[PDB]
């Protein structure tokens, strides 16, 4: 049995059925990429898989227990990035990363920021940085987390090609071990087609 | 010539002395604490620049280690 599965999900926003009855089971160590065609509907589905949005019909299931019951263990194994970074603008990058778990000592600190591409910009305020860097500080969480499941909503937006390559290289190691990630980008991604499994929305 | 002949009545001015000396002490305290604060902050920022020099001294040491 897979870790995360989706059963007869239905979404409706203002007389438009965005998606209806989509169901998919995700096995451990997989690189599912939702394709989509419209701007919104991929974002709502990625949001609803994480449990922000209660499904109108159907349910999303995690080791056989639904998301309204097993929350305290579901939130302990998830990493989410959205269109907005989710960070605090006034604080420094170091404190914004230190809010979340671990960081702290150098075994989990100052290389997570460095491998993202942010050497020499650790102490500068986030407001005084690029929007690409304002999302890079959010993408730097991947190197220190202990979450098995990652759902990222447009990760490669205004990050340079070196950052994209280093990101996907980090994603490969999480793919080899037991870990499920769902990402959605408009840009094509430069890895072999056989490893990525396409779960496209249908109507 | 002095208006106050006795040294003791320089500390007791007709029963109004305590409020005058309260004005004196609340005159002395903020100016002294301002001067000590500013001198201490000057010394602290000089020490911070010295410790900053220590940290890129270690950075150039690490660069020499990388070059060698």
């Amino acid at each position: 049995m897979g870790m995360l599965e989706a059963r007869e999900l239905l979404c409706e926003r203002d007389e438009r059925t965005l998606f209806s009855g989509l169901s998919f089971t995700l096995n451990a160590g997989e690189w599912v990429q939702i394709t989509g065609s419209n701007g919104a509907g991929k974002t709502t589905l990625l949001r609803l898989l994480t449990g922000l949005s209660r499904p109108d019909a159907g349910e999303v299931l995690w080791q056989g227990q639904p998301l309204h019951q097993v929350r305290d263990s579901y939130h302990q194994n998830l990493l989410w990035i959205g269109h907005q970074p989710g960070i605090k603008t006034r604080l420094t990058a170091l404190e914004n990363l230190h809010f979340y778990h671990r960081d702290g000592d150098t075994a989990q600190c100052l290389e997570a920021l460095a491998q993202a591409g942010l050497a020499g910009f650790e102490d500068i305020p986030v407001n005084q940085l690029s929007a690409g860097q304002q999302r890079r500080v959010a993408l730097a969480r991947l190197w220190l987390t202990r979450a098995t499941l990652w759902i990222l909503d447009q990760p490669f937006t205004a990050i340079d090609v070196n950052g994209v390559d280093r990101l996907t290289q980090r994603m490969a190691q999480h793919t080899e071990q037991g870990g499920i990630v769902i990402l959605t980008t408009h840009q094509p991604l430069n890895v072999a087609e056989s490893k990525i499994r396409r779960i496209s929305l249908t109507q | 010539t002095p208006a106050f002949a006795s040294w003791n009545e320089f500390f007791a001015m007709g029963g109004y002395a305590f409020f005058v000396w309260l004005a004196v002490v609340m005159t002395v305290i903020p100016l002294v604490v301002l001067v000590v604060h500013s001198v201490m902050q000057h010394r602290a920022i000089l020490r911070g620049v010295a410790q900053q020099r220590a940290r890129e001294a270690r950075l150039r040491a690490a660069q020499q280690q990388e070059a060698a």
Binding site: R54, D72, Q76, L78, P85, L91, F99 | -
Partner: protein, 219 residues
């Protein structure tokens, strides 16, 4: 991580070394502002001090109450607070208890000076502190749900503002009557007791309601 949420809210509130003074000075702005219009005669001010300090405290709390639930929506940090591995009522309890650091205890520090500026007496200052220590957290806990509902999907016309301000009626009417009855020397324990009972009730019932309110707000 309860205390870590506490410390992060304190750190986003206060930024530099000497920055705590502004919530202290704004209250003096209001306390001087009322006699600028009303008058300098020192008996009417002793008469009207409860309305003075309670309007000032309500203004400070309502002015600072926005950052609880409004700012964190746009930056998106509220969502990953919602998915932090800790129950949401504990999270909103931490956030409102951090909000109390902004308005309540600076008010408790500045109470003797504004008591001296408004005349009164030492018993007035004593009952002043004993009712402020009970009135500020219930004010924050009661102001939280209306702010929680107003963050929801942006279509609501006029009806949501009734949930936030006109709930302060029993709290403020009970507090000002007690502080006015404390001016002429009378037993006032029976009103401090009901203020404490209201404090306990709203402290028990507020975070669990605001958790569902925040669940409803973002869908």
């Amino acid at each position: 991580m309860f205390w870590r949420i506490f410390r992060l809210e304190l750190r986003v509130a206060f930024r530099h070394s000497a920055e705590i003074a502004n919530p202290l000075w704004f209250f003096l702005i209001v306390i001087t502002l009322f006699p600028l219009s009303i008058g300098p005669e020192p008996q009417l001010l002793a008469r009207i001090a409860p309305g003075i300090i309670w309007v000032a405290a309500l203004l400070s709390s309502l002015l600072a109450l926005e950052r609880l639930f409004r700012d964190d929506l746009q930056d998106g940090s509220l969502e990953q607070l919602m998915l932090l591995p800790l129950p949401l009522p504990a999270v909103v309890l931490a956030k409102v208890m951090a909000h109390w650091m902004v308005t309540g205890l600076p008010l408790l520090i500045l109470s003797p000076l504004v008591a001296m500026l408004l005349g009164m007496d030492v018993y007035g200052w004593q009952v002043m502190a004993l009712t402020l220590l009970l009135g500020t957290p219930t004010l924050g806990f009661l102001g939280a749900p209306g702010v929680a509902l107003t963050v929801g999907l942006k279509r609501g016309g006029v009806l949501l503002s009734i949930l936030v301000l006109p709930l302060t009626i029993p709290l403020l009417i009970f507090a000002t009557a007690a502080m006015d009855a404390a001016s002429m020397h009378l037993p006032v324990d029976g009103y401090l007791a009901i203020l404490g009972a209201l404090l306990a009730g709203t402290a028990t019932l507020s975070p669990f309601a605001t958790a569902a309110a925040l669940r409803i707000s973002i869908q």
